[PDB]
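Consider the following assembly input.
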Amino acid sequence: NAEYLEAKSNALFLKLRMEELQVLTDCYTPEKVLVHRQIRDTLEAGVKKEKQELSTSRQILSSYEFLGPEFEGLVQEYTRLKDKIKDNRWMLQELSKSLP
Amino acid sequence: KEVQATVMDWWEQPVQLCLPSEERGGLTLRQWRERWTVAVTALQRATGSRS
Amino acid sequence: EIRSQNMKKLKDKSEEYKYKIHAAKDQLSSAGMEEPLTHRSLVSLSETLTELKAQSM
Amino acid sequence: DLQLKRKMLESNKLQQIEKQLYVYFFQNEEQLKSIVGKLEAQTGGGSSA
């Protein structure tokens, strides 16, 4: 009984493995493999370019962050004021077009 | 479970959506697939052939 | 006694499977298929590029 | 599950070609235009300029 159960378990495992390998042979034909290679090369070139840009930008931001919280408050205020001026100008332009 | 995952990859072929901005003949792959799907659907409507 | 007979059939089938698995491994190698060229590996690589553009913006 | 999906690919030739479309996209643009154009011409549409 012990021998029989062992033989049954081994046969089921080998069937499963055979069927897996047959599916992989159907999926990756030489033509497709070539395409997958082209796609890799484009993706790899993109990953490399973006990793370099991220590294340069992170280096510049680190120089401003060194001028303290007070500067950041000033920058926030400046930015708020520029945004309000831009909104008011935008409102004046829209009232002139309506003089029928 | 691993074998089931492999069967799934074979059926969906996910590698086709990996480069969206690539244009060939002035259109993206998606656009081409869409064109294909519209054409296949029009052919199936003409050819009474109710799928 | 029935199980002993069935065990003989199972051993023959196991030998048949081992033979088909070798033949399939040989066909995949001739097609130049490497691991990084798989759907799963290439998707994984595209997902890494999107993540990096988001970090750069 | 494998027997059902293999059968599905052997019966439907149009689905097989769909699955090959991305291959044509990266290797042969002319073929892609041709394969998609043949399928569109067959569908009569009178384009006005």
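The two ends of chain D are 50 Å apart (CA to CA). Ask yourself how this observation constrains the way the partners meet.
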